[PDB]
Amino acid sequence: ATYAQALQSVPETQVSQLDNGLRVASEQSSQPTCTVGVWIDAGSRYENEKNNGAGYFVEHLAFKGTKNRPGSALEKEVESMGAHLNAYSTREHTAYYIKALSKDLPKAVELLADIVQNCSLEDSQIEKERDVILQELQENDSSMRDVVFDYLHATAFQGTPLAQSVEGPSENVRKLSRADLTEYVSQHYKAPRMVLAAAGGVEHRQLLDLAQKHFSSLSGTVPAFTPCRFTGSEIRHRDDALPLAHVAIAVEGPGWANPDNVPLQVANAIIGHYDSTYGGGTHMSSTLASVAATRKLCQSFQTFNICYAETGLLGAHFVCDNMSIDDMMFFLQGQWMRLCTSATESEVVRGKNILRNALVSHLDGTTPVCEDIGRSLLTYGRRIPLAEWESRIAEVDASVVREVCSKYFYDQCPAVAGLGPIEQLPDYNRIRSGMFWLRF
């Protein structure tokens, strides 16, 4: 194959639906292991200030027992077959999945339906998980990146439910009752909002029969989603006891289904990423990475394209000592401007190659493919094939990158989060002025 025949030879995601509206999607291989999961259109952005944290609490109680499998029994079953049960929650999505052997798919599927359908939500377990969730909140406080991105979401989407954190404030953790959680599950764990994905040695017809045997009870065939205003704003938490400062800056980027995402991702690949444990250092094609390695300006920087249904965070996060924040801002915004006005074809080619490599390398293993299927059916209503992603990347050039980075970056108000010894984090007006060029 020539990577054009290899893309054309990738197995096809097969999608069906139950009468209740539960979608069933699978990518089959010849591997002897599979990943099967449920992805739900439920998150913190669906929570208000009183219920905020309920979804994380329900994820916490997910494996602690159902009416059929009390307490540890479920875990025992999973552990007794060599399978791995995992879960996660975001501001928009929730997922419960099993990594099992291909011959364990029936039981795995059964284990999932029970988990999403019949969680006990027992009050004793609710108190134990209350204690656990409080300790995990204090554990999350120690992670400067998690805090700085929660801050970025809180100031960018202030007044909206997208500013909410996934876990909610600790006061809600202490106040959430069983009635709160049962209401959350009854309003958000619905078949039309769920996707049963499976990647690996899984036949779609057999998975569909399993879903019709285990999920057909679910809601047949309503509060959901209001848009979230973006705000140019800054939140600076100064703690000079912290050794390194974290700075996250983002403009309003596109939502999930916007084609602008493909050129913008290309542009982010042009800026790239860095940390001080890199081989390439000063020789890196990314200008910011080479300046950061030559001057030791930062410990790391990453570009990001966070997407929600209708908006997102397009920007960069960097970590540096107190005396270099300013420099890190100057060279980062400059790169943004250099892309808006003078993108240049060869680095667009490099960024396109980086994006194709990221997309292909990410989908390695049954679990990434299962997540791709579930999250893709939630965000696009479809699994976009890699051949299509390649078609969209192939139609990117320096004119396209210049135009889209102009549309999203140039002369736009960013949202800014600073955490730590951030006295040298530039004043908001100085950053905002760094978002345009007078020469241009």
Partner 1 sequence: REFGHLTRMRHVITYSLSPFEQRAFPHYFTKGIPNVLRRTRACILRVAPPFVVFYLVYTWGTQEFEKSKRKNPA
When asked if residue 439 is in the footprint of ligand CDL (CB under 6 A), the reply is yes
When asked if residue 438 is in the footprint of ligand CDL (CB under 6 A), the reply is yes
| 395 flagged as catalytic | no
Give Cβ neighbours of residue 264 (< 8 Å, ≥ 6 apart): 253, 254, 305, 314, 404, 405, 408
Give Cβ neighbours of residue 119 (< 8 Å, ≥ 6 apart): 58, 61, 62, 65, 66, 185
> Among residues 337 and 393, whose Cβ is nearest to ligand 3PE?
337
Out of 59, 167, 347, 371, pick the active-site residue.
59
376 to 415: interface string for ligand 3PE, x by CB under 6 A:
----------------------------------------
- Please say whether the beta carbons of 152 and 145 come within 8 A: no
Which one of residues 88, 278, 330, 428 is an interface residue with ligand CDL (CB under 6 A)? 330
What is the closest distance, in whole angstroms, from the C-beta atom of residue 429 to ligand 3PE in the complex?
Answer: 7
Q: Which stretch binds ligand 3PE (CB under 6 A): 56-64, 182-190, 302-310, 431-439?
A: 431-439
When asked if residue 426 is in the footprint of ligand 3PE (CB under 6 A), the reply is no
Interaction residues for partner 1, span 144-163 (CB under 8 A): 155
Rounded Cα–Cα distance for residues 342 and 78 (Å): 55
What is the closest distance, in whole angstroms, from the C-beta atom of residue 232 to ligand 3PE in the complex?
Answer: 14
- Nearest Cα to Cα of residue 263 among 275, 277, 273, 253: 253
- Please say whether the beta carbons of 423 and 238 come within 8 A: yes
Rounded Cα–Cα distance for residues 24 and 216 (Å): 12
Partner whose footprint covers residue 131, from ligand 3PE, ligand CDL, partner 1, none (CB < 5 to 8 Å by kind): none
> Among residues 222 and 241, whose Cβ is nearest to partner 1?
241
Which one of residues 234, 260, 372, 390 is an interface residue with partner 1 (CB under 8 A)? 234
Encoded tokens for 246: 């974290």
Burial class (CB in 10 A: 0-12, 13-18, 19+), 402: buried
- Would you tell me the crossing angle of helices 345-362 and 398-408 to the nearest 10 degrees? 80
Give Cβ neighbours of residue 357 (< 8 Å, ≥ 6 apart): none
When asked if residue 221 is in the footprint of partner 1 (CB under 8 A), the reply is no
When asked if residue 141 is in the footprint of partner 1 (CB under 8 A), the reply is no
HEC-encoded secondary structure of 168-224? CCHHHHHHCCHHHHHHHHHHHCCHHHEEEEEEECCCHHHHHHHHHHHCCCCCCCCCC
Q: Rg of the chain over CA atoms, in angstroms?
A: 23
Partner whose footprint covers residue 231, from ligand 3PE, partner 1, ligand CDL, none (CB < 5 to 8 Å by kind): partner 1
When asked if residue 434 is in the footprint of ligand 3PE (CB under 6 A), the reply is yes
- Backbone torsions φ then ψ of 219, nearest 5 degrees: -40, 130
What is the closest distance, in whole angstroms, from the C-beta atom of residue 270 to ligand CDL in the complex?
Answer: 18
Query: Closest residue to ligand CDL, Cβ-based?
Result: 438
When asked if residue 235 is in the footprint of partner 1 (CB under 8 A), the reply is yes
User: Rule CB under 8 A: which residues touch partner 1?
Assistant: 155, 231-241, 322-323, 325-326, 413, 421, 423-424, 428-429, 432
User: Rule CB under 6 A: which residues touch ligand 3PE?
Assistant: 433-434, 438
Q: Which residues are catalytic?
A: 59
